[PDB]
Scaffold this motif. Sequence first.
Motif, PDB file in Angstrom:
ATOM      1  N   UNK A  80       8.681 -10.295   4.457  1.00 23.00           N
ATOM      2  CA  UNK A  80       8.829  -9.357   3.352  1.00 23.00           C
ATOM      3  C   UNK A  80       7.707  -9.533   2.339  1.00 23.00           C
ATOM      4  N   UNK A  81       7.353 -10.782   2.035  1.00 24.89           N
ATOM      5  CA  UNK A  81       6.276 -11.040   1.088  1.00 24.89           C
ATOM      6  C   UNK A  81       4.993 -10.351   1.536  1.00 24.89           C
ATOM      7  N   UNK A  82       4.530 -10.687   2.742  1.00 21.62           N
ATOM      8  CA  UNK A  82       3.249 -10.172   3.202  1.00 21.62           C
ATOM      9  C   UNK A  82       3.284  -8.658   3.347  1.00 21.62           C
ATOM     10  N   UNK A  83       4.391  -8.103   3.850  1.00 19.03           N
ATOM     11  CA  UNK A  83       4.492  -6.650   3.931  1.00 19.03           C
ATOM     12  C   UNK A  83       4.322  -6.024   2.554  1.00 19.03           C
ATOM     13  N   UNK A  84       5.009  -6.575   1.550  1.00 18.85           N
ATOM     14  CA  UNK A  84       4.923  -6.018   0.205  1.00 18.85           C
ATOM     15  C   UNK A  84       3.498  -6.079  -0.320  1.00 18.85           C
ATOM     16  N   UNK A  85       2.760  -7.130   0.042  1.00 20.97           N
ATOM     17  CA  UNK A  85       1.415  -7.290  -0.509  1.00 20.97           C
ATOM     18  C   UNK A  85       0.514  -6.102  -0.181  1.00 20.97           C
ATOM     19  N   UNK A  86       0.744  -5.434   0.949  1.00 24.65           N
ATOM     20  CA  UNK A  86      -0.137  -4.360   1.396  1.00 24.65           C
ATOM     21  C   UNK A  86       0.042  -3.050   0.633  1.00 24.65           C
ATOM     22  N   UNK A  87       1.082  -2.912  -0.172  1.00 29.06           N
ATOM     23  CA  UNK A  87       1.365  -1.707  -0.932  1.00 29.06           C
ATOM     24  C   UNK A  87       1.093  -1.917  -2.416  1.00 29.06           C
ATOM     25  N   UNK A  88       1.075  -0.845  -3.206  1.00 30.65           N
ATOM     26  CA  UNK A  88       0.919  -1.002  -4.655  1.00 30.65           C
ATOM     27  C   UNK A  88       2.167  -1.612  -5.276  1.00 30.65           C
ATOM     28  N   UNK A  89       2.050  -1.947  -6.560  1.00 32.95           N
ATOM     29  CA  UNK A  89       3.139  -2.585  -7.298  1.00 32.95           C
ATOM     30  C   UNK A  89       4.051  -1.513  -7.884  1.00 32.95           C
ATOM     31  N   UNK A  90       4.881  -0.937  -7.022  1.00 34.69           N
ATOM     32  CA  UNK A  90       5.776   0.147  -7.426  1.00 34.69           C
ATOM     33  C   UNK A  90       7.121  -0.446  -7.824  1.00 34.69           C
ATOM     34  N   UNK A  91       7.820   0.123  -8.809  1.00 36.40           N
ATOM     35  CA  UNK A  91       9.079  -0.494  -9.251  1.00 36.40           C
ATOM     36  C   UNK A  91      10.229  -0.291  -8.288  1.00 36.40           C
ATOM     37  N   UNK A  92      10.292   0.851  -7.616  1.00 37.36           N
ATOM     38  CA  UNK A  92      11.459   1.195  -6.821  1.00 37.36           C
ATOM     39  C   UNK A  92      11.432   0.479  -5.480  1.00 37.36           C
TER      40      UNK A  92
END
Lengths: 52, 51
Positions: A5-17
Amino acid sequence: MTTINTHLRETLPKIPYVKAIDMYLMGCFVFVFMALLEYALVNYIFFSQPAR
Amino acid sequence: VFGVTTVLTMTTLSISARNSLPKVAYATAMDWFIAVCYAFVFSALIEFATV
């Protein structure tokens, strides 16, 4: 699961939702966590009752 | 295994979370939260060691 989950999230922008894949990963993490919790619940009651 | 893995996870998390912000020379709030969580985890490891 955590690292995935960490690494997957890193590839996207910092969106709140919370995205959809984030919801799926959170569900999978809840299932894994509950599995380990159930093992520990068996370990706790195992000496007192071996059939439960 | 519980203790060592929780400490390793906390370390990786404390390293990753800091990566987002610019290299400032003070401690933010998220850093305080991470430090307190690291304290709790290490204290649990030391409680198992004492037991």
